[PDB]
Design a protein around this ligand. Structure first.
Ligand SMILES: CP(=O)(O)c1ccc(C(=N)N)cc1
Ligand SMILES: [Ca+2]
Length: 223
């Protein structure tokens, strides 16, 4: 997260860190046994870490659980990043309390103009590199599909939306990938891609979760 603020420990309870020896992507807890992330975050050997603030210190509220299975969307295209969404089932259910909570799936798509909360442990600079130890947050609006398509000609599909500031300076970044975009208490997006981070006229591109609700529910109902 470039240009954001320190969230505060456990103030984003559905935020997860995907660890394979080190933090490599974010994700969101959608029920006690399932996590949603970006398909471009896929790897074998994922350990899911819940209840994290400082990912380098054990502070007392963590639950580290291994994944028993991961399911990349059937239509994921790694060249275009269309359908950049994956499901990860945990080996055992997480214990839910006020600091580890699921985030509700959307019942409708959110509109341009809606303000959302984006969070993650990714890079905090647009030029160099500086990864934070504690969770960063950014409030940003969903942009209109026209400006989104204007910023990225021939690249935005109906499964994507832009959120951010055209002026630059505030955006998600590398390391935030797979993380949540929550608007009015519902998971609306997944940190997916963008050109560089926080550049002028290159807002962040997010997977449009409302389009995948049926696929998520039935996949979890059969696995
Ligand atoms: C494909 P990725 O995971 O490296 C990524 C994700 C988000 C951005 C951004 N918001 N500018 C840039 C790159
Ligand atoms: Ca920790």
């Amino acid at each position: 997260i470039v240009g954001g603020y320190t969230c505060g420990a456990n103030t984003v309870p559905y935020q997860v860190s995907l660890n394979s020896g080190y933090h490599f992507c974010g994700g969101s807890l959608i029920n006690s046994q399932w996590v949603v992330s970006a398909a471009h975050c896929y790897k074998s050997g994922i350990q899911v870490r819940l209840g994290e603030d400082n990912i380098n210190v054990v502070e007392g509220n963590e639950q580290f659980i291994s994944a028993s299975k991961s399911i990349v969307h059937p239509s994921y295209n790694s060249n275009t990043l269309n359908n950049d969404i994956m499901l990860i089932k945990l080996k055992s259910a997480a214990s839910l309390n006020s600091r580890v909570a699921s985030i509700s799936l959307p019942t409708s798509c959110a509109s341009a103009g809606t303000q959302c909360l984006i969070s993650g442990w990714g890079n905090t600079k647009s030029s160099g590199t500086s990864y934070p130890d504690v969770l960063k947050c950014l409030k940003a609006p969903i942009l209109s599909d026209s400006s989104c398509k204007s910023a990225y000609p021939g690249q935005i599909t109906s499964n994507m939306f832009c959120a951010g500031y055209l002026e630059g300076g505030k955006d998600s970044c590398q390391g935030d990938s797979g993380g949540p975009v929550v608007c009015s208490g519902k998971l609306q997006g997944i940190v997916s891609w963008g050109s560089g981070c926080a550049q002028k006229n290159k807002p962040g591109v997010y997977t449009k979760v409302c389009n995948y609700v049926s696929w998520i529910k039935q996949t979890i109902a059969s696995n």
